[PDB]
């Protein structure tokens, strides 16, 4: 929790289990990784005073999802922007020093009200940690937004991610 | 609204714009396509009497997402199972004969309470159309579940997809 920003290389290290250690939170590797960098992460501040993350994904026309989604009509899948938010909430839990593997548990409400085209430059994620619970399972609840070149386009309320150690199962 | 089941070849045709025609609903192509076949589609029946879809994805250990999500811990991304549901709701709107390009608009509550491992055989999607609205924009609201080998593992309430006869204002 000493470090407050992460490069792409740090995130790739995380995807190999080499940032938080084996059996702890892992980002997906490409092509499921939806984050290039984390520009801010903290356990204080944010909308609820319980922490926040700001992260970025650079957009270029050659990103793999543009070719297949959709043919003749390239647009970033909303589900992947949403997944970036789960990825970040999972990363937060690992970053705090909690053990166990990350699993997205769902969301309260998701809204898509804009799009990421291949001509965009940069997607930014803003995640506000609402609550962390440490009862039987460690979990985080958060709200998030996705913005493209300054403009808010997706929101999610009540994003939930849990950590599962060897003794707990799905 | 005449054909009630679709093969993978039909879905691939749909991803090329060749099922519903240019400018109308399109499934994503691989690797974003999350459906192998639609085993049932109808505009009557289902939980609300307004239609339903049953669709399937065959699972094998070589599906692309297993290698990157996660290294040493393969599991289907929940976001892609969720996307299968938006893909199916969009397909429903095209299948009804409505014009325009599909865009997922979001969801009410989403829950992940199980997982698809590479040792699973088959994922099944059950979608219940709740409402279709034709006032300003054509849209569908639906509930859905994802099951693996008989066992329910994901649910979504209030899935929303809209059709856009032009995407320039989204």
From Swiss-Prot, chains A, B:
Active site per database record: 69
Record-level Gene Ontology MF annotations: (3R)-hydroxyacyl-[acyl-carrier-protein] dehydratase activity; trans-2-decenoyl-acyl-carrier-protein isomerase activity
Keyword vocabulary terms for this entry: Cytoplasm, Fatty acid biosynthesis, Fatty acid metabolism, Isomerase, Lipid biosynthesis, Lipid metabolism, Lyase
NAD is among the record's keywords: no
Pathway per the UniProt entry: Lipid metabolism; fatty acid biosynthesis
Gene Ontology biological process terms in this record: unsaturated fatty acid biosynthetic process
Catalytic activity: a (3R)-hydroxyacyl-[ACP] = a (2E)-enoyl-[ACP] + H2O; (3R)-hydroxydecanoyl-[ACP] = (2E)-decenoyl-[ACP] + H2O; (2E)-decenoyl-[ACP] = (3Z)-decenoyl-[ACP]
Location in the cell: Cytoplasm
GO cellular component: cytoplasm
EC number, as in UniProt: 4.2.1.59, 5.3.3.14
Family annotation (InterPro entries): FabA (IPR010083), FabA_FabZ (IPR013114), HotDog_dom_sf (IPR029069)
Gene3D superfamilies noted in UniProt: Hotdog Thioesterase (3.10.129.10)
Cross-referenced HAMAP family: FabA (MF_00405)
Assembly and binders: Homodimer.
Alphabetized PANTHER family for the sequence: 3-HYDROXYACYL-[ACYL-CARRIER-PROTEIN] DEHYDRATASE, 3-HYDROXYDECANOYL-[ACYL-CARRIER-PROTEIN] DEHYDRATASE
Function: Necessary for the introduction of cis unsaturation into fatty acids. Catalyzes the dehydration of (3R)-3-hydroxydecanoyl-ACP to E-(2)-decenoyl-ACP and then its isomerization to Z-(3)-decenoyl-ACP. Can catalyze the dehydratase reaction for beta-hydroxyacyl-ACPs with saturated chain lengths up to 16:0, being most active on intermediate chain length.
Family under the similarity heading: Belongs to the thioester dehydratase family. FabA subfamily.
Protein name in the entry: 3-hydroxydecanoyl-[acyl-carrier-protein] dehydratase
Organism encoding this protein: Pseudomonas aeruginosa (strain ATCC 15692 / DSM 22644 / CIP 104116 / JCM 14847 / LMG 12228 / 1C / PRS 101 / PAO1)
């Amino acid at each position: 929790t000493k470090q407050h920003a992460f490069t792409r290389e740090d995130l790739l290290r995380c995807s190999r289990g080499e940032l938080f250690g084996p059996g702890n939170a892992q980002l997906p590797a490409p092509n499921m990784l939806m984050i290039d960098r984390i520009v801010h992460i903290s356990d204080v501040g944010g909308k609820y005073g319980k922490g926040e993350l700001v992260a970025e994904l650079d957009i270029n026309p050659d990103l793999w999802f543009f070719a297949c989604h959709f043919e003749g009509d390239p647009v970033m899948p909303g589900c992947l922007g949403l997944d970036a938010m789960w990825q970040l909430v999972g990363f937060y839990l690992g970053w705090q020093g909690n053990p166990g593997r990350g699993r997205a548990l769902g969301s309260g409400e998701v809204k898509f009200f804009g799009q990421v085209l291949p001509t965009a430059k940069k997607v930014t994620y803003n995640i506000h940690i609402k609550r962390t619970i440490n009862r039987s399972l460690v979990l985080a609840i958060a709200d998030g937004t996705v913005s493209v070149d300054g403009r808010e386009i997706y929101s999610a309320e009540g994003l939930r991610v849990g950590l599962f150690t060897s003794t707990d199962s799905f």
